[PDB]
Amino acid sequence: HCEEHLDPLSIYCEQDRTLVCGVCASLGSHRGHRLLPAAEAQARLKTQLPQQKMQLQEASMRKEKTVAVLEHQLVEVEETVRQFRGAVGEQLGKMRMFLAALESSLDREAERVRGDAGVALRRELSSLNSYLEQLRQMEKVLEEVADKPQTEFLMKFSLVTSRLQKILSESPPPIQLPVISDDFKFQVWKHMFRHLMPALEELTFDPSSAHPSLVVSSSGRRVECSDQKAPPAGEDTRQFDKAVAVVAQQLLSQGEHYWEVEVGDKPRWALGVMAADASRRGRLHAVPSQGLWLLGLRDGKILEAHVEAKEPRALRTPERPPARIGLYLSFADGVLAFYDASNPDVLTPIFSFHERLPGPVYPIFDVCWHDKGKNAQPLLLV
Amino acid sequence: HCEEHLDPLSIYCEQDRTLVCGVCASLGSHRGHRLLPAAEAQARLKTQLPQQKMQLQEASMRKEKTVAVLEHQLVEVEETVRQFRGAVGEQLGKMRMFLAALESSLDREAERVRGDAGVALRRELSSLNSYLEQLRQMEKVLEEVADKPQTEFLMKFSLVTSRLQKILSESPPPIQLPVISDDFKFQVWKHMFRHLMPALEELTFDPSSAHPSLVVSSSGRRVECSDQKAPPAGEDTRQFDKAVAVVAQQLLSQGEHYWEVEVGDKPRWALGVMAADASRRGRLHAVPSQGLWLLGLRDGKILEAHVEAKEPRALRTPERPPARIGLYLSFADGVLAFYDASNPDVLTPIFSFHERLPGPVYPIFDVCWHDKGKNAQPLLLV
Ligand SMILES: [Zn+2]
Ligand SMILES: [Zn+2]
Ligand SMILES: [Zn+2]
Ligand SMILES: [Zn+2]
């Protein structure tokens, strides 16, 4: 069975992993190799079978789990494209809802104006038609008395004359559409901004936090620093002891939020958000790395952003001292933007931080020192 | 016929404008009055009739014309409300057209991404299904050779072993949707602005006007000041002789217009509009009351508005020196606004005049002095 020495295969060559005849093995191709008897070779190779079997089983289970992961990835591609479509739909429907509402309201007002013009004009019209037929009647009553016997002419001519005269002097006495010009596009665009914001987050001045000088009122939505001297504050690690400030009890942790506060003519204040990880006791250092994101006003008109530096950044003083501040907070984009919100229609950006906030934050209102009575105005949540 | 003296009426009392008897007139109620005979009274009163008749005719014609004016005013109320509605429709359709187009384009891109994911994933999936069935075939081919007569086991076991081994090591190798976050509203809003503008007015550098140093190129839409020394200009009262400037041949007279000019890195220039009523010869004083509405750049980075004062107003230097200026002109609102237009998506306002321009204006481009070679860059109409 050697096929070359005609003598069957009985020796296994281990360096060539093939069978051989006794001669190839004695003095032939395989004379110097490592060889052993065939029975021992098969009994040595058979022992490797459990491990080859299990390496195959394990490889197949790996690939099966990968197949499972890919099959899941397909439906997650489906769902992701679905949510993308739906999110575009919803963010654009905000704008389309606004335009639709605006157009309908403009149209209602148009119809109102035009109908009122119609009735006013038609009234003056029918009252001239009456006056004009009175004139007609005068004219040919005058021609009735124009040619009649002498004495009856004398008996009524000058009553007719007087009547004519001052029904001539009884003569009758004599729109408001907001017609639109080129900057209307631009006014609608500027008004759309305020609507792009989320519904006003309805927060609450949290008396569990307020500095002992402050009082909350109007259902926890107005904070006022008091005429009177206050007791010292206890060591509750999140009541304010030195900085006269107060937080909302609502903790903001995800998504996007918008809120407005009415400052009016208050000469000094600060507004923004404080991290939950930083404590509120002792003197505070108003820079981001302390968990403080603050916009401030001092001396009635000087507006300072409290960004990570030594000095705060002076800002462009607006036309008027801002009477209401709007605050937009996006965690997804790490953004705290401050807006002049005195115009209830159009928002004007003051400043914005671009920092991914570490974790959850509280809206903080520094209703700053009463300073011997000159800063007694309140903070009002709009 | 007196009804009190029984004796007929024959005398007319002129101060009481009534008839009387001879007795009332002789010694009675009317004894001291002014009286005349009845025949003369009727012959005196009859003469006033033509003028009373014509005063009536003229009063009636006046009221008739007023009736005509009111009747016209009604249909003009109709047409005014119609045009108001249609103008709101059209200015808002601008915005709605934009949003619709944007949503469709986002959707097309979504489908593209998802289909390509589908094919890539399904390819890797069917190629693992093939690899896994190969593993199956390996496994029970291995079990076919696991238990067979000695020598044929030895004759093929280790070819099977090698095959298994490196088809095990032949193992297989291992989306891009622009998924949208909260500031997408805001990006779409900022991109809408550029679309609120009217179609680019397609102007032409008018060589009939250019200062003798300049050359127009690219179909009258690029002006460059030349290396070379120029001839003096003739006394055509609207060619520029001292200020090296050039106008569009298009005269703007009504409505609203928008155009963009590419300045790039040009260190010094001015752009804006010049009145047709002011002449372009000699040295020019760049303030409004001379018919010049100009924004300027000097020393590469300093941006000055040329408003009616002694000094020009310095402006906020943008992040980068602006590479393209956009100009919006509304006569209806008396407005010339300048925009940073380097971002082909979002426009940023530099400055705007708020003055009702007297009459028609030309777009003027001060392609300022070549200044011995350092300001040789061109002005390009976008
Ligand atoms: Zn042999
Ligand atoms: Zn050998
Ligand atoms: Zn009498
Ligand atoms: Zn009398």
Residue numbers in the entry:
A (entry chain A), B (entry chain A): 85 to 258, 263 to 470
Wording from the paper:
Here we present the structure of Mus musculus TRIM72, a complete model of a TRIM E3 ubiquitin ligase. Its domain organization includes an RBCC domain followed by a PRY motif associated with a SPRY domain identified in splA kinase and ryanodine receptors (PRYSPRY) domain.
The overall structure of the TRIM72 dimer has an elongated shape. The coiled-coil domains (CCDs) form the main scaffold of an antiparallel dimer with a length of approximately 17 nm. In the middle of the CCDs, the structural core consists of the hendecad repeated region of the H1:H1′ helices (prime indicates the second protomer of the dimer) and the H3:H3′ helices followed by a pair of PRYSPRY domains. First, several arginines (R356, R368, R369, R371 and R386) and lysines (K317, K330, K389, K398, K460 and K462) are situated on the concave surface, consisting of variable loops (VLs), and contribute to its positive charge. Second, each PRYSPRY domain displays a concave surface that is positively charged toward the same side, facing opposite the CCDs. Recent cryo-electron microscopy (EM) analysis of TRIM72 and the crystal structure of TRIM72 ΔRING also revealed that the CCD ends are dynamic.
